């Protein structure tokens, strides 16, 4: 029909990346846009781009930061959460509590991949260590998700601080099973 079959009542990973790139990020410009043509974007603020000085940190959308990095005109600032120490702290937090979820940013999986691919030499920590820590976090989250799927009911469910990618993963199965259970319960009454 007007919309494909797989795009009905859910999202696609490409659209999730599209959503994630609409957020701001900090970068180190390599040129001097500030005066002693100029950007007039309409969807995003253009004042910051027109006023950038080399080596002075500024804030711009992630999509524009990647576009600048494509030409090698800026250096992206890796967020504070990505650093190793924070990752070990979050892994310990996850291990200590076998019931609750950690409080990582909602875009902690898409941003990780985007930065690991596009910006592989801007981090201040070894890349392999970060990849391993992210893998461990993902595996623990998968375990907890599997354990929590046994409590589906016909009233509601709560998953505090769950990333967008995992919710997208689980949207069809959880929704369909809960809908079937709710239909059975409604028929029973």
């Amino acid at each position: 029909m007007s919309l494909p079959a797989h795009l009905q009542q859910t999202f696609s990973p490409e659209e999730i990346q599209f959503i994630v790139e609409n957020e701001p990020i900090k970068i180190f410009p390599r040129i001097t846009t500030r005066q002693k043509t100029r950007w007039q974007l309409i969807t995003t603020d253009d004042k910051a781009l027109n006023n950038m000085v080399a080596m002075r940190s500024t804030e711009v959308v992630l999509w524009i930061a990647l576009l600048l990095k494509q030409q090698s005109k800026c250096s992206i600032v890796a967020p504070q959460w990505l650093t190793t120490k924070e990752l070990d702290r979050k892994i310990q937090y996850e291990k200590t509590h076998p019931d609750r979820f950690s409080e990582l940013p909602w875009n902690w999986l898409v941003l990780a991949r985007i930065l690991f691919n596009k910006a592989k030499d801007d981090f201040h920590d070894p890349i392999h260590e970060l990849r391993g820590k992210i893998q461990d976090l993902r595996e623990i989250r998968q375990i907890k998700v599997l354990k929590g799927l046994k409590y589906l009911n016909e009233s509601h469910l709560q998953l505090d601080n769950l990333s967008l990618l995992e919710i997208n993963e689980l949207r069809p199965f959880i929704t369909e099973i809960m809908d079937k259970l709710r239909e059975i319960h409604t028929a029973s009454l």
Binding site: Q71, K120, H128
Partner: protein, 566 residues
């Protein structure tokens, strides 16, 4: 006009000024379809333009007819044209039907210059240059290594005096000097990848990938022109040292990359086959030991036994072979190779390895690329064959990346198969003694066999020619004569005749070895074709290769014998 090595940046800036607007594509790159060096040059140029965000198109071309066809096909909107690997040993002005008077747009008397709507850039290494493409037209722009200023001053003056023009004797002497210059063999002098990397260094956009591509391009000339590789090797050593990070105490990490100098041997796919096979299917080893007869195999077995490596162990794949012998191999080779004369096998070569994946040397990579180019995958058959070769060009292009290791493995397997087939054919030829000898040249004509199908791609025929040249034609106390090798194809009734040049013994530095051995086949071939009428297809960029009808082979060979111009 010729752009000096210091002027490459100016030509690059001109290109960036003309064909850079985001309106539409205005850069077309023409690439020789059967040249690895041109492939690396095109890849590096494409990476540079990609980083600079310039619209472009790339068109593989084989032969000269396709060049003219495509040029006539081109749109006027195109403003910058790139030729890599050809356009140096021809009068490009006349061939392309280009009269500058039509291309002139702005003619300023004060400047005395006529701007043009299209600029032709030539990236060629073959010599001699065509003076009309050097000292003549302004539309054609040539990238020069330095030969023009080095050794063309007298010819430059002669050409200028001829253009400007008792006086008859002076004009005659100048024309005689010009004819003397034009009458010499064609030979390769430099690697195009070196020129492009000099440009890159001038603009300061060098990294490990570009250096690796330059290494690949320069190494491809090792098999044919050892002088060029020797001349251009020290710089590669210096740059490999420069770019490579010293810090290596860390153990292999999945993302680690290491491009360093390691002992490389004149062996065939040592790191992707067995040691016995590496010593068996090798040009130099066979030439020294003449493995095509049983006594050579016995000598090889005796050598392996003396070195202490068992026979079963020697035939085990490299990866699964015992690690102790793999560690001690260098010592074993040093101790026990002087006796059998293979003291030139040891060499220093570049080896690039990515984390947790097996290493691969430059020679093996080049061999895989050439194998993919060769065997990877009336007039209608000819067109189908040429278009299949064009497709193989792109099949090889993709393999030059780190995300396409599968293509590299397929190329290695195809290289093994091709080397096996060529070795079998060479064994047959040598055993049956089909190489007739003549005072001027040597003849080898193939008319039957199971592998005759493969011998239609010029690269495979050149591989066989090099194989034969190394064995008993460059060693074994034999005089150096040009060899004419031909192969039939009943499906089209023609001979893919190739004129190969002799080679001095490998790894023997001498004053005579320094002087290149010019290839005189081109001029004699052209003269013989002009005199007779046999529908000779002189269209390949390398004049050494032509296509002669079946019924007109022997008459052409007789004419060549009578020519006395080789």
């Amino acid at each position: 006009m010729y752009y000096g090595i210091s002027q490459f940046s100016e030509a690059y800036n001109k290109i960036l000024r003309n064909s850079s607007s985001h309106s539409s594509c205005q850069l077309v790159i023409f690439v020789s379809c059967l040249n690895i060096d041109a492939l690396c040059a095109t890849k590096m140029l494409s990476l540079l333009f990609k980083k600079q965000l310039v619209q472009s198109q790339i068109v593989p071309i084989f032969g000269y007819s396709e060049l003219r066809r495509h040029y006539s096909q081109l749109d006027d909107n195109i403003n910058s044209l790139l030729l890599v690997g050809f356009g140096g040993v021809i009068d490009l002005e006349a061939f392309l039907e280009i009269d500058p008077q039509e291309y002139v747009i702005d003619t300023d008397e004060k400047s005395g210059e006529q701007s043009f709507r299209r600029d032709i850039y030539v990236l060629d290494a073959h010599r001699p240059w065509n003076l009309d493409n050097i000292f003549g037209s302004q539309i054609i722009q040539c990238f020069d290594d330095g030969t023009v200023d080095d050794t063309l001053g007298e010819q430059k003056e002669a050409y200028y005096k001829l253009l400007e023009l008792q006086r008859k004797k002076q004009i005659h002497e100048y024309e005689g000097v010009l004819e003397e210059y034009y009458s010499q063999g064609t030979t390769v002098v430099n690697s195009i990848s070196a020129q492009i990397y000099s440009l890159l260094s001038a603009i300061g956009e060098t990294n490990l990938s570009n250096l690796w591509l330059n290494i690949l391009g320069t190494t491809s000339l090792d098999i044919a022109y050892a002088q060029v590789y020797n001349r251009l090797y020290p710089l590669l050593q210096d740059e490999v040292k420069r770019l490579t990070p010293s810090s290596r105490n860390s153990v292999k990490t999945p993302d680690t990359l290491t491009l360093n100098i390691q002992p490389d041997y004149y062996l065939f796919l040592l790191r992707h086959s067995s040691l016995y096979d590496s010593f068996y299917y090798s040009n130099y080893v066979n030439a020294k030991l003449s493995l095509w007869n049983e006594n050579g195999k016995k000598r090889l077995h005796k050598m392996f036994a003396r070195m202490g490596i068992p026979l079963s162990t020697a035939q085990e794949t490299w990866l699964y072979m015992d690690h102790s012998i793999k560690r001690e191999l260098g010592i074993i080779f040093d101790k026990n190779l002087d006796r059998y004369g293979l003291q030139d096998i040891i060499r220093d070569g570049f080896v690039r390895t990515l984390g947790y994946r097996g290493s691969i040397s430059a020679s093996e990579f080049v061999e895989a690329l050439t194998a993919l180019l060769e065997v990877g995958n009336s007039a209608q058959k000819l067109t189908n064959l040429r278009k299949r070769w064009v497709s193989n060009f792109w099949l090889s292009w993709d393999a030059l990346d780190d995300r396409k290791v599968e293509l590299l493995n397929r190329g290695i397997q195809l290289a093994q198969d091709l080397q096996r087939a060529i070795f079998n054919t060479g064994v047959a030829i040598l055993e049956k003694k089909l190489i007739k000898h003549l005072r001027i040249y040597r003849l080898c004509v193939l008319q039957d066999g199971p592998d005759l199908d493969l011998y239609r791609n010029p690269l495979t025929l050149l591989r066989l020619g090099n194989w034969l040249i190394e064995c008993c034609a460059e060693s074994e106390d034999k005089q150096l004569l040009p060899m004419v090798l031909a192969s039939i194809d009943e499906n089209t009734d023609t001979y893919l005749v190739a004129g190969l040049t002799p080679r001095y013994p490998r790894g023997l530095d001498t004053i005579h070895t320094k002087k290149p051995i010019l290839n005189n086949f081109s001029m004699a071939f052209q003269q013989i074709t002009a005199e007779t009428d046999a529908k000779v297809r002189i269209d390949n960029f390398e004049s050494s290769i032509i296509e002669i009808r079946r019924e007109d082979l022997s008459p052409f060979l007789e004419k060549l014998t009578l020519s006395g111009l080789l």
